[PDB]
Design a protein around this nucleic acid. Sequence first.
RNA 1: CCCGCAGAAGAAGCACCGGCUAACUCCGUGCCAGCAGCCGCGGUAAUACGGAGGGUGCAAGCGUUAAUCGGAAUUACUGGGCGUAAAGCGCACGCAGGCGGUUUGUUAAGUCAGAUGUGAAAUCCCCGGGCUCAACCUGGGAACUGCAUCUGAUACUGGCAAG
Lengths: 129, 106, 158, 82, 205, 74, 123
Amino acid sequence: SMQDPIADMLTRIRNGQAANKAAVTMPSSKLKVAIANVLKEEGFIEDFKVEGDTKPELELTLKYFQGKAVVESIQRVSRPGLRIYKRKDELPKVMAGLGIAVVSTSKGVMTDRAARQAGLGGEIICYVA
Amino acid sequence: MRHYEIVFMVHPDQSEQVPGMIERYTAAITGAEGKIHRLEDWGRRQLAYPINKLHKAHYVLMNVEAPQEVIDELETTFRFNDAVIRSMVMRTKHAVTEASPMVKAK
Amino acid sequence: ELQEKLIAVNRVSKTVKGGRIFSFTALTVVGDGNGRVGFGYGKAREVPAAIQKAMEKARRNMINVALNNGTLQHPVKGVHTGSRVFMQPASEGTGIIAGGAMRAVLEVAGVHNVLAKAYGSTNPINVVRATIDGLENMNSPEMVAAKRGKSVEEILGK
Amino acid sequence: MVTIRLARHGAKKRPFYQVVVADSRNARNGRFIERVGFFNPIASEKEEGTRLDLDRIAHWVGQGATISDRVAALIKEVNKAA
Amino acid sequence: ARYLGPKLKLSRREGTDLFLKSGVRAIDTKCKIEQAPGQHGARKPRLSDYGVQLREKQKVRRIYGVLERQFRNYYKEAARLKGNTGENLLALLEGRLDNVVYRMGFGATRAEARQLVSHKAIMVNGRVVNIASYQVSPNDVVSIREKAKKQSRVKAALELAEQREKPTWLEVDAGKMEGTFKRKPERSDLSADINEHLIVELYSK
Amino acid sequence: ARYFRRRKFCRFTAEGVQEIDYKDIATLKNYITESGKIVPSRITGTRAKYQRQLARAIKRARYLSLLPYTDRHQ
Amino acid sequence: ATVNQLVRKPRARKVAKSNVPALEACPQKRGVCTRVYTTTPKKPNSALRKVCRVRLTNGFEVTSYIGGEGHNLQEHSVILIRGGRVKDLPGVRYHTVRGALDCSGVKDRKQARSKYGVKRPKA
RNA sequence: CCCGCAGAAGAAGCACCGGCUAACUCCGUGCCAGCAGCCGCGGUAAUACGGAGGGUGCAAGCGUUAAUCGGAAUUACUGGGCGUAAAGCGCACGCAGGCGGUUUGUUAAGUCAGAUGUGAAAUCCCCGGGCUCAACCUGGGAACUGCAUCUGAUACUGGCAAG
Ligand SMILES: [Mg+2]
Ligand SMILES: [Mg+2]
Ligand SMILES: [Mg+2]
Ligand SMILES: [Mg+2]
Ligand SMILES: [Mg+2]
Ligand SMILES: [Mg+2]
Ligand SMILES: [Mg+2]
Ligand SMILES: [Mg+2]
Ligand SMILES: [Mg+2]
Ligand SMILES: [Mg+2]
Ligand SMILES: [Mg+2]
Ligand SMILES: [Mg+2]
Ligand SMILES: [Mg+2]
């Protein structure tokens, strides 16, 4: 069965990027929108939208630069079988700072830099490079 | 407020106080709103030709910007200060808040 | 300029009706030491020639690597046909820390300080291709800001 | 009882005594309660060779601790010279 | 604890003559340069990779007569100290008392200047030191012992010191028979034919 | 005693140089001959305006000691 | 592979077995030569290798090799054995220390003398 | 510790040199004797055995052996694999067990932040100082990666309650 919707999002982006898909459809959720919302500020995705009320659908517009996938790599860090939590001093650097780490802190989901500036730890959701 | 480009040189045997010297010049320059807006340094360098027997000496660059009067005092200091072997108070039209090849090489 | 390094030579052989026909191969990398490196491979009956075949092979098929003051820009992972390589940028003064095959490419490429490790098969020819492939995928802040449609200062954060 | 004495550390023919607060029953270099100073008998006669935190030492004396003979001389060769 | 065999054998091996022998009579005349010793020396030896690294390390050691054990301890200290390790190791080797005396001009050769230190003929800051490996610290003043100056060999070594481009970081005194180790030396001053990054890798293997 | 030619590329104009600097040792070392005498435009091809800037720069650098006057320094 | 599976059964540190079990992690052991004989080497080689059967102090009975030219070894000889197997002699894992106890040094040894217990020749 | 006395006088071995691995020939020997960490040598022109010269490494030590980690990503948490090379149970059900879609509120269990106590000294590390240097000794830091308690924060996970 489907047990980690977040990893499904990573596969949906990764498979669509490798298949040169213009857009991807998926069931929506607050966390999925929040992660898609975070992606917007760094330019990894073009736009996101939410349609439907009883069964919300999250729609992501993929982005390409020279006909090549914008999302070079993305991999799940915290998983249902193995949760990963990092303290503020030990927060990892993803793609030597060029990429971002989606971090779920007590003040909501933010990037590694936002957590680093605010001096906060949390759950490392994913690595983006 | 004319932009000057000091380039003095300090005896290789007195690089210990070179820092302190920077402070002295900077402090008096800043007294008349002497915007420094640049303070590089090339430490010691192998002089091309043996000036004053000294086959090697320090090297400092200060693209400062201060009134004409204050800077003139600096030249008097550099003249009667044995530590500074040679100077070159050039005068640039504008400012250079960047970097030179002498540091970008490393 | 153009610097030349011999990485490894070998005596391959194909049996023929009469007997064993021995041949020699040669692996080389050329580069200007300032962000450009190219590998070469050549087979010939005489070792002298094999080198020329490798030199011509290295002259063609060249790639650009975005160096950063004679050091890598970020840790990179390369994999080619069973050889896995890991290279990490290092501070100034550490020199080249790599195996014999991995070391040779870095001088012509212009890398001065790097920590490298070869996992899996250490076959010299596969190892060399693994390093170059990682270097080709290595991007600099200038193209990353353009590719992400952002500015350098914002993404860097300084 | 708790006593303030010197534990002999250092090397051969160059002793360096550590001034420690310890129970008298414990070994000379063994268990101790608190560090309160050191004493260098081979000091260069030009720089610091012995310093003690008299505040903590006075506190321990007020708690009931006894003073060794040699240390008493140290707690005197200082409070007199200054 | 010291090499006692012939010296020109080592000199001609590893190839470039590097600060050996009195230094007056032309080094080439005394032997046959560009020819390693041994009956088979007259041939082209295809050196390897290990080969190159080994030669460099051996060369450096002989220039300063430092035995492996000692040299390895310098490398450990150089890596421990902040900064670039290779230059730090070279600085430590140059800071030895016996080497400093040679560059100061009181010895014709590093070996002879080292013997002067060993035989209690050198004064450092008013204290007698006869240990060749003593590390000279910046601003120190090294002065030949009164009795020593009466040695005519020292006098002749001063004369010859003129030919060697006087090291900058060393303020030599002629008749004053003294020296001031101004400061630590820098890579630039030292012979540019030394590739310190090779030394660092070799011992880090 | 008289040649006068060109190389067909005033490198300074090419790179859009707007002010030749006397600290660009690398660049300068390309227009100073082995003896240490500024090379005429008639050879390298440098445009007239930039050569004037380049020539004062060489002088300042020689002064500053970043370059050598002639070659026989005793 | 799975962390849950690994939690249920942790990784088992394998114990590395020695190549010289009869030494019981001791550098050398003294023994008595039960039998002196000769044996033949493996396949790519041909010779008359000199080996000895020896009873050690701890009761282990093993066969040891003699690495020196000529030997004054016989019944009830007390020798000192060290580690080191013979590539071409299966079952031989030890070497007799020449020049120790009742084993004399090798005659005429001039190179690697310390490996055969031979005193420096007088000049 | 210092000072004088005399005269180079009283003070250098050990291992290796076929590849790995720095450094080679000559003689003897002739699958013999032998060496051998791995690869392997020797059957009459042995850079591999034995001797000689020569040369390489290390040095008052050099070698061998035993032992621990490394290299060994070769038990892989970081950091591996299971079509054919080792490795999918013959298949299904299914308990404990692990894991769990979308939703609000609810706590604070995890988690995260804050603070405080605790983390003996030595060791280790950094900056110094003392032995002529060095080891050695020592001053101040750092560190002790930890745990307890409290006050928060509450996204997420778990919690129950309703969707
Ligand atoms: Mg010793
Ligand atoms: Mg060799
Ligand atoms: Mg392992
Ligand atoms: Mg495998
Ligand atoms: Mg099979
Ligand atoms: Mg199978
Ligand atoms: Mg099946
Ligand atoms: Mg859930
Ligand atoms: Mg809690
Ligand atoms: Mg402690
Ligand atoms: Mg000291
Ligand atoms: Mg301490
Ligand atoms: Mg919840």
